């Protein structure tokens, strides 16, 4: 929190109006309080995503979002050039207030568990039509091309009069009369040129698609019977639309699919052209301002516009098909999206470990509100959060999307579920069996067995578990209210199964797999990574060396690895105002500390980043590079500008190993280790780096009280990857002296047991709260805006780990 000056400063209080302005061009974020400027700005921040307005609060608040238009009238005029936020609502959405990244919701019969939500990306608004300029129309195609440009206008005009449109000498919205309504030659040549270029473009588009068109009969193409025009149909100008008429032509599912692809490319080409001309999207059309309600990539368009475009294109596809030219939808090439990592994508909810059952007959229910990827069953207490449910021996589950039983792999079982279906899960620890029912009917394997699994070793017991994929919703009923169970009586009660939470006076606590990367000690038995603690010799300091166990061999795992040291160095509360043997006074009075990383020969320096991270680094980026580091500048100025301070904030201070590769050695595997040394002055906030002795040009400045962990990000390319060297330099203290109070004046390098290497893990188990804030969101009116209310207080007892600031 950085104090910011404004007239009559005060913590947000009733009748306060906060205006927020975001200029993505700078980029910059600025505020106004009750119309007065706030003398501070955020700027130069990351732009790799989409921004949304947000309010955060605790209980005891009531606020209203004003977004302009009919969604809250502004109390102050937006600064010149800024657009009301209500205009940014996408075509196929309706404006409303929503929570962010919710894993749980309320529902008619109880709490609903929610899987991850699929989000758009800033690149989803870039139209990307296929190249269609290198394409050269076949001669036969070019002959139909001229007809396509004008005939398409013909069908349009027939539709336009059907719209009630009549030619307008002057366009008028009340008139519904179009100046551009007339004959293709009558229509202005520049507008006509866009039409003619479009008809040729469709043929080139097909060639790019790869569908092949050649005319089986030229005579059939010659035979045309364009529909006549009624007099009411004719425009004020008197021009009559004469689309050529072709009742005979028919489509095929592949051909219809190919027409949907054709409509996408056309719209994307148009969108790219309009963007180049300088248009943008807006929920409310504004022709003078060059804002269009349809200027989005075809994928995000509303269904009505999609249907209209598909109709036009399918009419045009048919005219070519009827001429005799053969359209053959291009072969389909197998494609995989893999939007995210499956091992870390689906959200897993399990009961708390203390509820594990080691005997008896237990039953619970899972209602599938959606019908997508969802798994439900029983898991062992040591279930891992980064593995798909049932992909290993730690869970026996049923996947009702297609019908499968998962345990150490997938096997066909049961039938797919439908929305509202209830899956009953039974475990019988006397017979050592697991049974699944769907709406009370026991699901059976192909062999006809009525037990999904059998001969199950009890071990440490079992817990109810479920897994929800992106965009999925389930309802887990453990049976505290036996009356709430919907099919327990039908199947399970007589067979002798008890609801899981039958005699629990409190609801069963659940944990979920949280996808927030966290640093954890490298496991002692990690199959791929091994850390060795090397003692300091007469010429070598203490070291922590990383080796890739399974390098080269098959099944080797090669991915970005984010490592840090378990303990931080802390900068002083107050910064200082403005032989080769150590000199005792200098070394006892220095505030500069040092540590190095040795990158072994064979490890590519271009695949290594060395430096520091703050306690809040959480990026498990598999394509990491320094441009992805979070950064933002906070600039505080005076009441007439006059910048007074400009602080850069980040969570990763590193140098790239590639900056120290000589251009000559570049492109050749080096035979020398690269040692990168990091120096921090804890009393001034300065951080500098050296590469093989030479001082580099990279330097950073941090603020007092900052906590920094030594860090290394590496993509292994060798069996010996890197080595943390906890040594010293001349007149510079080792890291142990900064980390440990008792060693504050000890210049001998040390590596105590607490200091160890930690790696970034993508998923962790997290306890879901038993109660949640009750937030009421509604629309107060067309002038008041969108109201958010939260009145009932809620508190938790937090446990804080000091060194990790978590």
């Amino acid at each position: 929190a950085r104090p910011v000056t404004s007239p009559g400063q005060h913590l947000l209080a009733p009748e306060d109006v906060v205006s927020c302005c975001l200029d993505l061009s700078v980029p910059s974020i600025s505020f106004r309080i009750n119309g007065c400027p706030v003398q501070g700005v955020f700027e130069s921040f990351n732009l790799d995503g989409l921004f949304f307005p947000v309010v955060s609060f605790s209980a005891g608040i009531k606020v209203r979002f004003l977004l302009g238009g009919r969604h809250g009238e502004f109390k102050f005029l937006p600064p010149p050039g800024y657009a009301p936020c209500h205009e940014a609502v996408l075509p196929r959405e309706r404006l409303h207030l929503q929570p962010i990244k919710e894993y749980r919701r309320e529902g008619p019969r109880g709490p609903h568990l929610v899987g991850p939500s699929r989000c758009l990306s800033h690149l989803d608004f870039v139209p990307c039509p296929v190249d269609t300029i290198q394409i050269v129309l076949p001669p036969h195609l070019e002959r139909i091309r001229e007809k396509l440009a004008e005939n398409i206008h013909e069908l349009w005009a027939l539709t336009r009069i059907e719209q009630g449109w009549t030619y307008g000498p002057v366009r008028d919205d009340n008139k519904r009369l179009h100046p551009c309504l007339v004959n293709f030659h009558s229509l202005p040549e520049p507008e006509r040129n866009y039409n003619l270029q479009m008809s040729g473009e469709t043929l080139k588009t097909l060639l790019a698609l790869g569908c092949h068109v050649g005319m089986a009969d030229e005579k059939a193409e010659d035979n045309l019977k364009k529909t006549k025009l009624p007099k009411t149909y004719m425009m004020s100008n008197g021009y009559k639309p004469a689309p050529l008429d072709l009742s005979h032509v028919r489509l095929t599912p592949a051909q219809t699919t190919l027409v949907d692809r054709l409509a996408e490319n056309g719209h994307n080409v148009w969108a790219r052209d309009r963007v180049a001309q300088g248009w943008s999207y807006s929920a409310v059309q504004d022709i003078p301002a060059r804002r269009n309600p349809r200027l989005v990539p075809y994928r995000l368009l509303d269904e009505a516009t999609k249907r209209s475009n598909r109709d036009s294109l399918c009419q045009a596809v048919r005219t070519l098909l009827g001429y005799g030219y053969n359209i053959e939808p291009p072969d389909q090439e197998p494609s995989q999206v893999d939007s995210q990592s499956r091992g870390d994508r689906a959200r897993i909810f399990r009961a708390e470990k203390s509820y594990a059952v080691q005997s008896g007959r237990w039953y619970f229910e899972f209602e599938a509100v959606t019908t997508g990827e969802m798994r439900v069953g029983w898991a062992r207490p040591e279930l891992r959060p980064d593995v798909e449910l049932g992909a290993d021996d730690l869970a026996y589950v049923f996947n009702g999307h297609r019908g499968q039983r998962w345990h150490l792999g997938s096997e066909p079982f049961g039938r797919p579920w439908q929305s509202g279906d209830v899956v009953g899960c039974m475990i019988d620890l006397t017979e050592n069996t697991i049974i699944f029912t769907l709406n009370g009917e026991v699901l059976m394997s192909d062999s006809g067995s009525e037990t999904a699994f059998r001969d199950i070793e009890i071990g440490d017991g079992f817990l109810p578990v479920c897994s929800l994929g992106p965009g999925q919703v389930g309802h887990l009923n453990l049976g505290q209210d036996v009356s709430s169970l919907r099919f327990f009586a039908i199947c399970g009660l007589q067979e002798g199964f008890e609801p899981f939470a039958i005699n629990m006076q409190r609801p069963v606590t659940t944990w979920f797999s949280k996808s927030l990367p966290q640093f954890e000690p490298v496991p002692l038995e990690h199959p791929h990574y091994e850390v060795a603690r090397m003692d300091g010799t007469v010429d070598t300091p203490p070291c922590l060396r990383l080796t890739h166990r399974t390098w080269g061999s098959q099944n080797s795992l090669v991915e970005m690895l984010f490592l840090r040291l378990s303990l931080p160095v802390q900068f002083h509360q107050h910064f200082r105002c403005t032989d080769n043997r150590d000199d005792p006074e200098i070394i006892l009075n220095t505030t500069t500390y040092y540590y190095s990383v040795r990158v072994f020969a064979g490890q590519e320096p271009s695949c290594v980043w060395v430096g520091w991270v703050t306690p809040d680094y959480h990026q498990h980026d598999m394509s990491f590079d320094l441009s992805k580091v979070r950064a933002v500048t906070v600039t505080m100025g005076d009441e007439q500008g006059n910048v007074h301070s400009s602080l850069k904030c980040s969570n990763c201070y590193m140098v790239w190993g590639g900056d120290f590769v000589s251009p000559g050695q570049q492109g050749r595997i080096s035979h020398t280790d690269l040692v990168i040394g990091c120096l921090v002055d804890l009393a001034t906030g300065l951080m500098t780096f050296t590469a093989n002795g030479k001082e580099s040009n990279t330097f950073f400045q941090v603020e007092p009280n900052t906590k920094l962990f030594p860090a290394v990000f590496v993509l292994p390319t060798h069996q010996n990857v890197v080595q943390f060297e906890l040594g010293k330099q001349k007149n510079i203290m080792p890291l142990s002296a900064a980390m440990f109070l008792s060693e504050r004046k000890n210049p001998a390098p040390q590596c105590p047991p607490r200091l160890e290497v930690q790696m970034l893990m993508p998923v962790s188990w997290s306890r879901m709260p038993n109660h949640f804030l009750q937030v009421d969101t509604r629309r107060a009116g067309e002038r008041l805006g969108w109201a958010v209310q939260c009145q009932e207080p809620l508190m938790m007892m937090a446990l804080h780990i000091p060194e990790e600031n978590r």
Binding site: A13, P14, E15, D16, S19, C20, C21, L22, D23, L24, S25, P27, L47, G49, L50, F51, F52, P53, V54, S56, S58, A59, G60, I61, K62, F65, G68, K75, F76, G81, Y82, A83, P84, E87, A88, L90, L95, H96, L97, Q98, P99, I100, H122, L123, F125, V126, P127, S280, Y281, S282, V775, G785, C790, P793, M795, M797, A798, L799, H800, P802
Partner: protein
């Protein structure tokens, strides 16, 4: 700094409208956006 620390803290939640704006080369989205929030009631110390 050595023992684990404890304290009672408030639960906090966030609310947004479904409005998403960004920038990319060749994007169809406008660049400058504006909105407001009016505070009707605020209890400074509903809890400790």
């Amino acid at each position: 700094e050595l023992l684990l620390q404890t304290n009672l803290i408030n639960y906090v939640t966030s609310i947004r409208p479904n409005i998403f704006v960004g920038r990319a080369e060749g994007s169809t989205q406008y660049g400058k956006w504006y909105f407001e929030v009016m505070v009707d009631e605020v209890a400074p110390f509903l809890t400790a």
